[PDB]
Design a protein around this ligand. Structure first.
Ligand SMILES: Cc1cc2nc3c(=O)[nH]c(=O)nc-3n(C[C@H](O)[C@H](O)[C@H](O)COP(=O)(O)OP(=O)(O)OC[C@H]3O[C@@H](n4cnc5c(N)ncnc54)[C@H](O)[C@@H]3O)c2cc1C
Ligand SMILES: Cc1cc2nc3c(=O)[nH]c(=O)nc-3n(C[C@H](O)[C@H](O)[C@H](O)COP(=O)(O)OP(=O)(O)OC[C@H]3O[C@@H](n4cnc5c(N)ncnc54)[C@H](O)[C@@H]3O)c2cc1C
Ligand SMILES: COCCOCCOCCOc1ccc(C(C)(C)CC(C)(C)C)cc1
Ligand SMILES: COCCOCCOCCOc1ccc(C(C)(C)CC(C)(C)C)cc1
Ligand SMILES: COCCOCCOCCOc1ccc(C(C)(C)CC(C)(C)C)cc1
Ligand SMILES: COCCOCCOCCOc1ccc(C(C)(C)CC(C)(C)C)cc1
Ligand SMILES: COCCOCCOCCOc1ccc(C(C)(C)CC(C)(C)C)cc1
Ligand SMILES: COCCOCCOCCOc1ccc(C(C)(C)CC(C)(C)C)cc1
Ligand SMILES: [Mg+2]
Ligand SMILES: [Mg+2]
Ligand SMILES: [Mg+2]
Ligand SMILES: [Mg+2]
Ligand SMILES: [Mg+2]
Ligand SMILES: [Mg+2]
Ligand SMILES: [Mg+2]
Ligand SMILES: [Mg+2]
Lengths: 495, 495
C-alpha cells in the first residue's frame, strides 16, 4: 500500500530521479522502451570510436536495489496515453501489446525527439545523433564508405563525392562530431587509407555566423579558426533546405538568392528538438493546454491543468510557467513594508521571495541593469510584470534535467508527506558551465568566472571534469581504460 | 612486377598467412567480405558478455604494413568464381557490382558455413554461433526475452516456455555457450531478475552419448556431471529432426520410435559444417574433382587438377589427399636399408620419407600396433596401401588452419624461387591439445601428456593459455581488462 510513483523515461531526468528517490518511502516503477541510461555528452566520441558503449551507458536494472534493502521496478514499455482523470497510463511493448498501469504520482521525463524541420529527405537520408544506436550507425556508415572507395571499380570523382561528410548544426554536438571525425580522419584513417586520404572532406553547416553560438565570441572565433586550420569547411551562415540521395541544397542566411548544391556520402543531422508523440497527444487532452506546442509546468514542476496536482514533468519535454509576480502585487508589497517601493527593496527580500517566485532570482533578473526608483503600487505592478515576462525556462540540457531530478526526488523524500509539505521551494537551476571538444586536442570551456580556449592542458581539464560527472565507478573505469586503449592502440575499424 | 598472391578469406587461415607472408617478395592482396579476423575460440564468451568484441577481433588493415616498410592490400569483396585457366577470379561488392582480378597464386581460405542438415525450420528460427554478429544477436535475443517475461501481461506457463534456452551440439562450442549462459543466468540474471530466475532453463542436445566426444571419457563424464550439478538439461543421445516457431522436435538415438516435442524461447545451433557456394561452384569446374563434396589438395596443399599448380587451399574448406605410398613401392623399397622388408625398416627411415609422405608420420600411423615382419614386395605394397587408406586429413580447427598458414607462407618465403624449390616438405600438423570451459569456473583440457579436469586453478590455466594465443598486444590488453571488468562490475545488460 505504498504510494506508487511511475517515472516515464530512462534519460537524464528519469534516471537521476530513480537514483535519488527513496525506495523505502515509495513504490517506484520506471517505464522506458530503453533499458539503459545514455550519457549523451560522450556520444560524439562514440561516432569515431574514441570511447566505447560501456562508458556511455548505464543499465537501469543495476540501480534498482539500494543499500538499505529496498527496491524499485523497471518495465520495458513505451507509454502511449496518459489518463489524468482516472490516474493511469496506457503503454505498449515492442510487439504492440497494450498494458494498463495505475499511479499515485506520474513523473514525465520522456525528453524530445529529433527535428527534421519538415525538410524533404532528411528523415530518409540523414543520420541523427541522438542516441547510442545513432552514433554506432554513423561510425559504421563512415567505415563502409572508406572500404567502398578502396575498390577498383570507382573513379576519383565519385570518391570525392562519397567521401564528403556533411554535419548539419553548429552547436556543441555538430561541432564535436565534426571534430571527432577530423581527429579520426587525420590519424587512423590517414595511416590506414593513405591512397584516399586526400579525397576526404568534412563540412559543418550552421544557420548563424558562429560555431558554438551560446559560448563566448572568443570561443566561437577560436573554434572556427581551429576548424580552418584542420581544413574543415565551415559553412556558417547557411542552412539546409532540401536533401536528396547523393546531394543536398543549402541556402545562404545572408542572401536569400544564393543557393549551393553539395554532393555528399554521409549526412549527419545534429540540430533541432521536437516533441514526442506522447506529449502532443497528452497536450490535446488538457483543456488549458490544448493548443500548446510544449508541456507547461508549475514553478514546482507540476503539470498545469491537472486537478489532482499529481503529474510532474522534468527535462526536455517541458517548459516552466511560474506563478506570476504581478498577480500577487499587494502581497509582495506587504512583505516589504518599511522600505519605499524600490527595485532595491525588492532585491533585499530576493532570498525569501525566490522560494516561491523563481523569476526573482539574481540568475534570472538583472537588478543592476533594471534598477528602479521609488514606485507607485501600479508602477510596481508593471515592474513585477516585466520580471514575469523576462523569465526564461531552464534550457534543455542534461545539467538542468539532472538538477530538476534531484530537486523533485528530494521533494518527494523530504517534503511531500512531512511537516514541511507547505514549505516546498520553487525550482531554480544553477549554471555550472559548458565544455566542448573542437579537435586536435583542443578543448574549450565557458564556465562561471573563466573561459578555457585550448592548449596543452585543455584535454586534461576535460577528462578531470567528465570522469567526475559519470554516474558509476564502472563507467569511470571504462573511461580511463578507453583513453589508454585509444592512445596505445588507436581507434578500432571493426564494423 | 612482383608476383601477385591473392588470399581469399580473413579467417584463421587467410589472416595468419597474411601475418607471415613476405610483403617485400610478393604483391599480396587479401580479399574478404569481412574486414576483420575473428578469434573464434572466444566467441562463446561474447554470447554472455564475459568478453568484448575487441578481444575477439583483429582489423585486417592494421597488419598490412610490415616493419621492413613494405605493404599488403585488402579488398572488401566476396569471391564468386575462380577461373583457373585464365588465372583470375570474379568478385562482387556488397552492392553486387562485379570486379575481376588477376593473380599469379591463389590462396583459398574461405572456411565453411553452418550446416542446417536440411532440417525444416532451423535456418528460419535458429541462431547460429559462427561469427561475431551471431554471438551478438544471441546475447541480444536472450536479453530481450528476460525483459519481455518481466512484463505483467504474461502467464507463468508462457514464461517457462519462453525462458527455455536450447543449444544443439555437444561439441566444445555447444558446451561452452551452454556453460556461459549458465554462469550468466546464475550470477547477473539471478540478481537482476529474481522473480523469473526459477522459470529459466537450459538444455543441450547431442546425438551421441558424450558431451565433448573428442576429449577423453573422464572429461566427458566430468562435463555431464558438472552440467547436472548446474541443473542444465543434458539431452545426450538425442538429435533435432524439426524446428517450428515456438517448439522443436527431437528424436532419440537409442530408440527410433521415441520423440519429444519441446517448447523454447531461444534455439542455438552449434553444430555442423557445410561447404561455401564458392567452393561448390569451383568444384564443378574441375574435371577430376567435379563430383566431390569437398575440395582436395595434395600433400603440399595444392588444389588437385589445376595444370598450373598455382592454386592452394588451407583451413576448413579443404581436405588433403597425399601422394600415394603404394604408387611408389619400388622407389620406397630401394630407399630402405635392410636385409628385409619389415615395418621396422620403414619406420627407421620415417624421418626422411615423411618429408614427401605425411601419412608415414608417427602421428598418422601407429607402427607398434601395425608391426609387420619380413614381407615380399607385393605384401609391402599392400602394407603401404593400408597406410595410404589410413591417412586422416587435418581436422577442421583453428590450430590446423594456423599451422597450415605458417607452413605455406614459409614455403612462399623461403622455398619458392630459391635453390630449395624442390626441397619443399609435405605439410604435417602438430596436435597441441584442446581446452573447454564447462561452467562455474571449471576448465577441462585434453593435452598431449595431461588431462585437466576442473579445480580452482583450471581457469587460471585457461587464461595463461589464451592470452598467449591472441595475435596482438591490443587484444591481450583487452583480454586482461575484460576479466577485471567482469569480476568487479559484472556482465553488462546493454542491448
Ligand atoms: C549528442 C548530445 C550531446 C549532448 N551534450 C550535452 C552536454 O554536453 N551538456 C548538457 O547539459 N546537455 C547535453 N545534451 C542534452 C541532454 O542530452 C538532454 O538535455 C537530456 O538528454 C535531457 O534529459 P531528458 O530526461 O529530458 O531526456 P532524455 O535523456 O532524452 O531521455 C528521454 C527518455 O524517455 C524515453 N522515452 C521517450 N518516449 C517515451 C515514451 N513514450 N514512453 C516512455 N519513455 C519514453 C527515452 O527512451 C529516453 O530514455 C546532449 C544531447 C545530445 C543528443
Ligand atoms: C564458436 C567456435 C569456436 C571454435 N573454437 C575453436 C577452438 O577452440 N580451437 C580450434 O582449433 N578451433 C576452434 N574453432 C574452429 C575454427 O574457428 C575453424 O577451424 C577456423 O575458423 C578455420 O579457419 P578458416 O581460415 O578455414 O575459416 P574461417 O576462420 O571461418 O575464415 C573463413 C574466411 O573466409 C571468408 N569468406 C567466406 N566466403 C568467402 C568468399 N566467397 N570470398 C572471400 N572470402 C570468403 C570469411 O568471411 C572468413 O573471413 C571454433 C569455431 C567456432 C565457430
Ligand atoms: C558519484 C559522484 O561523485 C563525484 C565525482 O567523484 C570522483 C572523485 C575522484 C575521482 C578520481 C579519483 C578518479 C580522479 C580525480 C581526483 C582527479 C577527480 C573521480 C570521481
Ligand atoms: C568494486 C567497485 O569499483 C571499485 C573500482 O572503482 C574505480 C574505478 C576506476 C578508478 C580509476 C578511474 C582511478 C581507474 C583505474 C582503477 C583503472 C586506475 C578508480 C576506482
Ligand atoms: C592518456 C589518456 O589516458 C587517460 C584517461 C583518463 C584519465 C583521467 C580522466 C582518469 C585522469 C585523472 C586520473 C587525472 C582523473 C587520465 C589519462
Ligand atoms: C582475477 C580474475 O580476473 C582477472 C583475470 O584476468 C587475467 C588475465 C590474464 C592473466 C595472466 C595470468 C595470463 C597474465 C598476468 C601474469 C600478466 C597477470 C591474469 C588475469
Ligand atoms: C605473438 C606470440 O607471443 C606468444 C607469447 O605471448 C605472451 C603473452 C603474455 C605474456 C605475459 C607477459 C602476459 C606473461 C604470461 C604469459 C606468463 C602470463 C608473455 C608472452
Ligand atoms: C604494441 C604496444 O603494446 C603496448 C603494451 O602491450 C601490453 C598489453 C597488455 C599487457 C598485459 C597483458 C600484461 C596487461 C596489462 C598491461 C593491462 C597489465 C602488457 C603489455
Ligand atoms: Mg528521462
Ligand atoms: Mg539519456
Ligand atoms: Mg531528449
Ligand atoms: Mg523530458
Ligand atoms: Mg581464412
Ligand atoms: Mg576467423
Ligand atoms: Mg569456417
Ligand atoms: Mg578454409
Amino acid at each position: 500500500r505504498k504510494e506508487k510513483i511511475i517515472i516515464l523515461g530512462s534519460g537524464w531526468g528519469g534516471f537521476n530521479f530513480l537514483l535519488n528517490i527513496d525506495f523505502k518511502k515509495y513504490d517506484v516503477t520506471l517505464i522506458s522502451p530503453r533499458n539503459y541510461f545514455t550519457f549523451t555528452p560522450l556520444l560524439p566520441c562514440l561516432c569515431s570510436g574514441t570511447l566505447s558503449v560501456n562508458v556511455c551507458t548505464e543499465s537501469i536494472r543495476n540501480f534498482l536495489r539500494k543499500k538499505n534493502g529496498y527496491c524499485g521496478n523497471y518495465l520495458q514499455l513505451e507509454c502511449t496515453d496518459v489518463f489524468y482523470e482516472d490516474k493511469y497510463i496506457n503503454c505498449i511493448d515492442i510487439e504492440n501489446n497494450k498494458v494498463k498501469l495505475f499511479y499515485d504520482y506520474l513523473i514525465i521525463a520522456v525528453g524530445a525527439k529529433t527535428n527534421t524541420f519538415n525538410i524533404n529527405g532528411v528523415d530518409k537520408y540523414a543520420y541523427f545523433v541522438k542516441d547510442i544506436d545513432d552514433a554506432l550507425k554513423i561510425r559504421k556508415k563512415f567505415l563502409d564508405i572508406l572500404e567502398k572507395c578502396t575498390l577498383p571499380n570507382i573513379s576519383n570523382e565519385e570518391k570525392k563525392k562519397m567521401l564528403h561528410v556533411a554535419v548539419v548544426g553548429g552547436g556543441p554536438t555538430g561541432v564535436e562530431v565534426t571534430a571527432e571525425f577530423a581527429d579520426f580522419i587525420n590519424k587512423e584513417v590517414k595511416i590506414n587509407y593513405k591512397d584516399i586520404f586526400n579525397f576526404i572532406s568534412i563540412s559543418i553547416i550552421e544557420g548563424g555566423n558562429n560555431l558554438l553560438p551560446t559560448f563566448t565570441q572568443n570561443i566561437s572565433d577560436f573554434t572556427k579558426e581551429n576548424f580552418h586550420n584542420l581544413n574543415i569547411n565551415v559553412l556558417t551562415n547557411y542552412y539546409v533546405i532540401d536533401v536528396d540521395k547523393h546531394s543536398f541544397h543549402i541556402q545562404s542566411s545572408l542572401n536569400k538568392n544564393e543557393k549551393k548544391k553539395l554532393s555528399y556520402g554521409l549526412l549527419i543531422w545534429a540540430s533541432g528538438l521536437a516533441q514526442t508523440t506522447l506529449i502532443q497527444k497528452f497536450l490535446k487532452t488538457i483543456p488549458v493546454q490544448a493548443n500548446n506546442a510544449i508541456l507547461k509546468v508549475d514553478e514546482k514542476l507540476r503539470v498545469i491543468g491537472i486537478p489532482s496536482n499529481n503529474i510532474y514533468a522534468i527535462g526536455d519535454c517541458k517548459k516552466i510557467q511560474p506563478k506570476l509576480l504581478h498577480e500577487h502585487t499587494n502581497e509582495i508589497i506587504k512583505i516589504l513594508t518599511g522600505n519605499k517601493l524600490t527595485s532595491e527593496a525588492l532585491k533585499l527580500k530576493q532570498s525569501e521571495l525566490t522560494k516561491t517566485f523563481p523569476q526573482l532570482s539574481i540568475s534570472k533578473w538583472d537588478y543592476e541593469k533594471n534598477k528602479k526608483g521609488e514606485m507607485t503600487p501600479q508602477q510596481f505592478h508593471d515592474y513585477l510584470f516585466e520580471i514575469d515576462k523576462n523569465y526564461k525556462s531552464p534550457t534543455p540540457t542534461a545539467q538542468n534535467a539532472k538538477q530538476e531530478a534531484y530537486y523533485l526526488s528530494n521533494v518527494f523524500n523530504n517534503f511531500i508527506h512531512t511537516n514541511q509539505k507547505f514549505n516546498i521551494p520553487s525550482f531554480i537551476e544553477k549554471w555550472k558551465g559548458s565544455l566542448a571538444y573542437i579537435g586536435n586536442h583542443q578543448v574549450v570551456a565557458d564556465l562561471p568566472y573563466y573561459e578555457l580556449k585550448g592548449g596543452r592542458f585543455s584535454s586534461t581539464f576535460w577528462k578531470v571534469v567528465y570522469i567526475q560527472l559519470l554516474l558509476s565507478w564502472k563507467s569511470r573505469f571504462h573511461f580511463f581504460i578507453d583513453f589508454i586503449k585509444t592512445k596505445w592502440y588507436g581507434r578500432p575499424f571493426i564494423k
